[PDB]
Motif scaffolding. Structure first.
Motif, PDB file in Angstrom:
ATOM      1  N   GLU A 102       0.862  -1.173   0.000  1.00 29.05           N
ATOM      2  CA  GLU A 102       0.000   0.000   0.000  1.00 29.05           C
ATOM      3  C   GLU A 102       0.901   1.227   0.000  1.00 29.05           C
ATOM      4  N   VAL A 103       2.145   1.028   0.425  1.00 31.38           N
ATOM      5  CA  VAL A 103       3.133   2.100   0.456  1.00 31.38           C
ATOM      6  C   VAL A 103       4.066   1.949  -0.751  1.00 31.38           C
ATOM      7  N   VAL A 104       4.662   0.768  -0.899  1.00 31.92           N
ATOM      8  CA  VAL A 104       5.564   0.489  -2.015  1.00 31.92           C
ATOM      9  C   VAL A 104       4.668   0.160  -3.207  1.00 31.92           C
ATOM     10  N   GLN A 105       4.096   1.200  -3.802  1.00 37.02           N
ATOM     11  CA  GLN A 105       3.171   1.041  -4.916  1.00 37.02           C
ATOM     12  C   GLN A 105       3.777   0.769  -6.286  1.00 37.02           C
ATOM     13  N   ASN A 106       4.970   1.289  -6.540  1.00 36.81           N
ATOM     14  CA  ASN A 106       5.599   1.081  -7.840  1.00 36.81           C
ATOM     15  C   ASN A 106       6.954   0.386  -7.792  1.00 36.81           C
ATOM     16  N   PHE A 107       7.088  -0.669  -8.588  1.00 34.86           N
ATOM     17  CA  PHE A 107       8.327  -1.434  -8.670  1.00 34.86           C
ATOM     18  C   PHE A 107       8.342  -2.290  -9.932  1.00 34.86           C
ATOM     19  N   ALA A 108       9.542  -2.607 -10.409  1.00 40.85           N
ATOM     20  CA  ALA A 108       9.710  -3.405 -11.618  1.00 40.85           C
ATOM     21  C   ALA A 108       9.425  -4.881 -11.383  1.00 40.85           C
ATOM     22  N   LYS A 109       9.727  -5.356 -10.183  1.00 44.60           N
ATOM     23  CA  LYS A 109       9.515  -6.758  -9.873  1.00 44.60           C
ATOM     24  C   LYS A 109       9.674  -6.941  -8.373  1.00 44.60           C
ATOM     25  N   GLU A 110       8.942  -7.894  -7.812  1.00 48.23           N
ATOM     26  CA  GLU A 110       9.037  -8.162  -6.385  1.00 48.23           C
ATOM     27  C   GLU A 110       9.676  -9.529  -6.196  1.00 48.23           C
ATOM     28  N   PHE A 111      10.429  -9.674  -5.113  1.00 49.47           N
ATOM     29  CA  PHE A 111      11.110 -10.923  -4.815  1.00 49.47           C
ATOM     30  C   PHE A 111      10.854 -11.361  -3.379  1.00 49.47           C
ATOM     31  N   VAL A 112      10.930 -12.669  -3.155  1.00 51.71           N
ATOM     32  CA  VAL A 112      10.791 -13.269  -1.829  1.00 51.71           C
ATOM     33  C   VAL A 112      12.057 -14.116  -1.768  1.00 51.71           C
ATOM     34  N   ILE A 113      13.022 -13.668  -0.974  1.00 49.92           N
ATOM     35  CA  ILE A 113      14.321 -14.325  -0.888  1.00 49.92           C
ATOM     36  C   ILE A 113      14.746 -14.800   0.495  1.00 49.92           C
ATOM     37  N   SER A 114      15.410 -15.954   0.525  1.00 50.73           N
ATOM     38  CA  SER A 114      15.904 -16.540   1.764  1.00 50.73           C
ATOM     39  C   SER A 114      17.374 -16.913   1.621  1.00 50.73           C
ATOM     40  N   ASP A 115      17.888 -16.818   0.400  1.00 53.97           N
ATOM     41  CA  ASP A 115      19.282 -17.154   0.120  1.00 53.97           C
ATOM     42  C   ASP A 115      20.017 -15.883  -0.305  1.00 53.97           C
ATOM     43  N   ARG A 116      21.014 -15.476   0.477  1.00 51.89           N
ATOM     44  CA  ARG A 116      21.763 -14.271   0.156  1.00 51.89           C
ATOM     45  C   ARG A 116      22.389 -14.341  -1.231  1.00 51.89           C
ATOM     46  N   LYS A 117      22.644 -15.552  -1.723  1.00 55.60           N
ATOM     47  CA  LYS A 117      23.220 -15.700  -3.057  1.00 55.60           C
ATOM     48  C   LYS A 117      22.312 -15.014  -4.075  1.00 55.60           C
ATOM     49  N   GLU A 118      21.005 -15.089  -3.844  1.00 58.44           N
ATOM     50  CA  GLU A 118      20.041 -14.483  -4.754  1.00 58.44           C
ATOM     51  C   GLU A 118      19.918 -12.971  -4.605  1.00 58.44           C
ATOM     52  N   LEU A 119      20.688 -12.398  -3.684  1.00 54.97           N
ATOM     53  CA  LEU A 119      20.686 -10.951  -3.480  1.00 54.97           C
ATOM     54  C   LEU A 119      21.876 -10.343  -4.223  1.00 54.97           C
ATOM     55  N   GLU A 120      22.757 -11.205  -4.731  1.00 58.81           N
ATOM     56  CA  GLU A 120      23.935 -10.741  -5.460  1.00 58.81           C
ATOM     57  C   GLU A 120      23.477  -9.766  -6.538  1.00 58.81           C
ATOM     58  N   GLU A 121      24.044  -8.564  -6.508  1.00 58.32           N
ATOM     59  CA  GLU A 121      23.678  -7.510  -7.440  1.00 58.32           C
ATOM     60  C   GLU A 121      23.471  -7.941  -8.886  1.00 58.32           C
ATOM     61  N   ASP A 122      24.433  -8.657  -9.454  1.00 59.96           N
ATOM     62  CA  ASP A 122      24.307  -9.083 -10.839  1.00 59.96           C
ATOM     63  C   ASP A 122      23.161 -10.063 -11.074  1.00 59.96           C
ATOM     64  N   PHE A 123      22.880 -10.911 -10.088  1.00 59.48           N
ATOM     65  CA  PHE A 123      21.785 -11.863 -10.221  1.00 59.48           C
ATOM     66  C   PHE A 123      20.459 -11.103 -10.280  1.00 59.48           C
ATOM     67  N   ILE A 124      20.260 -10.184  -9.340  1.00 57.65           N
ATOM     68  CA  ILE A 124      19.036  -9.387  -9.307  1.00 57.65           C
ATOM     69  C   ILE A 124      18.834  -8.649 -10.628  1.00 57.65           C
ATOM     70  N   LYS A 125      19.910  -8.078 -11.165  1.00 60.19           N
ATOM     71  CA  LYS A 125      19.826  -7.353 -12.430  1.00 60.19           C
ATOM     72  C   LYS A 125      19.356  -8.241 -13.575  1.00 60.19           C
ATOM     73  N   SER A 126      19.905  -9.447 -13.662  1.00 63.26           N
ATOM     74  CA  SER A 126      19.506 -10.373 -14.713  1.00 63.26           C
ATOM     75  C   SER A 126      18.020 -10.698 -14.543  1.00 63.26           C
ATOM     76  N   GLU A 127      17.570 -10.745 -13.293  1.00 56.03           N
ATOM     77  CA  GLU A 127      16.169 -11.023 -13.006  1.00 56.03           C
ATOM     78  C   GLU A 127      15.281  -9.868 -13.446  1.00 56.03           C
ATOM     79  N   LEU A 128      15.708  -8.641 -13.146  1.00 55.30           N
ATOM     80  CA  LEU A 128      14.953  -7.449 -13.525  1.00 55.30           C
ATOM     81  C   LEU A 128      14.876  -7.349 -15.044  1.00 55.30           C
ATOM     82  N   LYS A 129      15.888  -7.892 -15.712  1.00 52.62           N
ATOM     83  CA  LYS A 129      15.946  -7.891 -17.169  1.00 52.62           C
ATOM     84  C   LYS A 129      14.714  -8.616 -17.703  1.00 52.62           C
ATOM     85  N   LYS A 130      14.491  -9.827 -17.198  1.00 49.24           N
ATOM     86  CA  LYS A 130      13.352 -10.647 -17.600  1.00 49.24           C
ATOM     87  C   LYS A 130      12.036  -9.880 -17.464  1.00 49.24           C
TER      88      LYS A 130
END
Length: 130
Positions: A102-130
């Motif tokens: 209700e606050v974070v109204q605009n974003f390119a993609k949302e993630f639910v993460i439990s593995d820090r490996k998936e927070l790696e900057e380049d990984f997130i970027k490739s994801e946002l690409k999709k």
């Protein structure tokens, strides 16, 4: 009974969407039964440090791609849930995400993460690409 300080969280949100701001990431944490702003920062590696196995948090982050005239920003909504968080709180976080949105109204993609490996900057970027 989960509540949220809309005003405080909305200010953090907007701080990140402001190009004239050095803050690229902000978090939203539970203070008892109320979601409030947590830490914020200008360096992404410091965001990853807030995401430990013992905690859960919501975060709005600005990633940057391109360069010079092609430089552009893409914002991500990230729900972090450490492996040590209980199954029940894990589920609760999923429900409360609605309140956060209700606050974070605009974003390119949302993630639910439990593995820090998936927070790696380049990984997130490739994801946002999709």
């Amino acid at each position: 009974a989960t509540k949220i300080d809309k005003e405080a969280c909305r200010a953090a949100y907007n701080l990140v969407r402001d190009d004239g701001s050095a803050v690229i990431w902000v978090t939203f944490k539970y203070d008892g039964s109320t979601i409030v702003p947590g830490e914020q920062g200008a360096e992404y590696q410091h965001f990853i440090q807030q995401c430990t196995d013992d905690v859960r948090l919501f975060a709005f982050v600005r990633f940057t791609t391109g360069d010079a005239m092609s430089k552009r920003s893409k914002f991500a909504l990230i729900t972090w849930i450490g492996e040590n968080v209980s199954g029940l709180q894990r589920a609760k976080t999923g429900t409360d995400k609605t309140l956060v949105k209700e606050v974070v109204q605009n974003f390119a993609k949302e993630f639910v993460i439990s593995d820090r490996k998936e927070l790696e900057e380049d990984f997130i970027k490739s994801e946002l690409k999709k």
